[PDB]
Design an enzyme around this catalytic site. Structure first.
Site, PDB file in Angstrom:
ATOM      1  N   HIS A  33       0.859  -1.246  -0.205  1.00  7.53           N
ATOM      2  CA  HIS A  33       0.132  -0.017  -0.004  1.00  7.53           C
ATOM      3  C   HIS A  33       0.826   1.180   0.170  1.00  7.53           C
ATOM      4  CE1 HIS A  33       0.145  -0.303   4.488  1.00  7.53           C
ATOM      5  NE2 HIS A  33       0.444   0.921   4.407  1.00  7.53           N
ATOM      6  N   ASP A  53      -0.388  -7.385   1.113  1.00 10.50           N
ATOM      7  CA  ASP A  53       0.154  -6.322   0.957  1.00 10.50           C
ATOM      8  C   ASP A  53       1.735  -6.276   0.882  1.00 10.50           C
ATOM      9  OD1 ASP A  53       0.495  -3.489   1.737  1.00 10.50           O
ATOM     10  OD2 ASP A  53      -0.510  -3.452   3.397  1.00 10.50           O
TER      11      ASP A  53
END
Lengths: 198, 4
Positions: free
Chosen positions: A36, A63
């Protein structure tokens, strides 16, 4: 720049995240960080200088990302702990109940224990599955940073936490913290990366 | 929990 786990870098002159771990992919130097933190090809800077670009990432779902660095960067097998360093020795995954620490540019180096594995975080962007939970505290800006045991075994990179209005979860008891990280081993095999160790 |  010397690439050390836990230090600050910016993405496209705007967001800040923390370096997770120095890695190589063949002759290419890089570091792993959280997905992210940037999109592919976003520019990473350390101390105002361009050090490389996001090469790949997966967020949400997972992620994870790795940034490929220019040749001038110096990769080091270390994670910042104040003015001192923890040497990266390998990536044996620790079990629930193990003590672990994490390093990042907002709260520094914090330790706690692993409390659960395979947690789903429901972020605004979508769910991220497969996260391990620890109760070491963390704050906004620590994402991407190193989670490592005192013995030097790299566990993963910071993803998210139940931060309070002060931007971190360090002011609530360890029992109420959920600080989540992305496991390192799947990031290493997915991108064919080797951890720099010393 | 939120990203970070």
């Amino acid at each position: 720049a010397n690439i050390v786990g836990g230090i600050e870098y910016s993405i496209n002159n705007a967001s800040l995240c923390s370096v997770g771990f120095s890695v190589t992919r063949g002759a290419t130097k890089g570091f792993v960080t959280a997905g992210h933190c940037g999109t592919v090809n976003a520019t990473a800077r350390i101390g105002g200088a361009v050090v490389g670009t996001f090469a790949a990432r997966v967020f949400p779902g997972n992620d994870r990302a790795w940034v490929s660095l220019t040749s001038a960067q110096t990769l080091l097998p270390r994670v910042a702990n104040g003015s001192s360093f923890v040497t990266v020795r390998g990536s044996t995954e620790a079990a629930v109940g193990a003590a672990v620490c994490r390093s990042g540019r907002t709260t520094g180096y914090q330790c706690g224990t692993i409390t659960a594995k395979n947690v789903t975080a429901n972020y605004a962007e979508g769910a991220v599955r497969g996260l391990t939970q620890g109760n070491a505290c963390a704050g906004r800006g620590d994402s991407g940073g190193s989670w490592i045991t005192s013995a030097g075994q790299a566990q993963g990179v910071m993803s998210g936490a139940n931060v309070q209005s002060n931007g971190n979860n360090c002011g609530i008891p360890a029992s109420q913290r959920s600080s989540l990280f992305e496991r390192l081993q799947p990031i290493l095999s997915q991108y064919g990366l080797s951890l720099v160790t010393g | 929990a939120a990203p970070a």
